[PDB]
């Protein structure tokens, strides 16, 4: 009946975005504007209305292919944020995440300790999470791309961004305590 606190959870997410904030563009596009992406994420719940969540976009290669494909060297990336949601129903709930994505790459280093370009652009998300069955949860959330860098006076209205859907697992049933 009552909610839980001081617990952890893990899952996977997959969504599509209208347009990315990339700088190197050299493609016409599959249809018009939509890029599907997959990844994994997990989080810890501190209280009924205050929790934490982290995530990172995995990668998949094709062992059966002899084509030159490179981009970075010893590079890594991860995202860390806080989750804030409200319990509308025992099974249906709403949540919002706010944090930042950390990105780092390697490019010529003489063991001196210097950087050229790091990724630290705070981001947030919004959606709802529902429980279909024990040890199995599913939720959908969206992200805003037009709301950073510089505030626009007039033009397009903020009513469309990133659309994603992922599943999450909650561990910590117990019996007494």
Q: Please check whether residue 80 is in contact with residue 104, taking contact to mean a CB–CB distance below 8 angstroms.
A: no
Q: Pairing between strand 76-86 and 119-133?
A: unpaired
Q: What does the block give as tokens for 144?
A: 């805003």
- Of 53, 131, 46, which is closest to residue 88 (Cα–Cα)? 131
Q: Please check whether residue 77 is in contact with residue 102, taking contact to mean a CB–CB distance below 8 angstroms.
A: yes
Q: Please check whether residue 42 is in contact with residue 54, taking contact to mean a CB–CB distance below 8 angstroms.
A: yes
Q: Report the DSSP beta bridge partners of residue 127.
A: 95, 141
Domains of the chain: 1-177 (2.40.160.20)
């Amino acid at each position: 009946m009552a909610p839980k606190d001081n617990t952890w959870y893990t899952g996977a997410k997959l969504g599509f975005s209208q347009y990315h904030d990339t700088g190197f563009i050299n493609n016409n596009g599959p249809t018009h504007e939509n890029q599907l992406g997959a990844g994994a994420f997990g989080g810890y719940q501190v209280n009924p209305y205050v929790g934490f969540e982290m995530g990172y976009d995995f990668l998949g290669r094709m062992p059966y292919k002899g084509s030159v494909e490179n981009g970075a060297y010893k590079a890594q990336g991860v995202q860390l944020t806080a989750k804030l949601g409200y319990p509308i129903t025992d099974d249906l709930d709403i949540y919002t995440r706010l944090g930042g994505m950390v990105f780092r790459a390697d490019t010529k280093s003489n063991v001196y300790g210097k950087n050229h370009d790091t990724g630290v652009s705070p981001v947030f998300a919004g959606g709802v999470e529902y429980a279909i069955t024990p040890e199995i949860a599913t939720r959908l959330e969206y992200q805003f791309t037009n709301n950073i860098g510089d505030a626009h006076t007039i033009g397009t209205r903020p009513d469309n961004g990133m659309l994603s859907l992922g599943v999450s697992y909650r561990f910590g049933q117990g019996e007494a305590a």
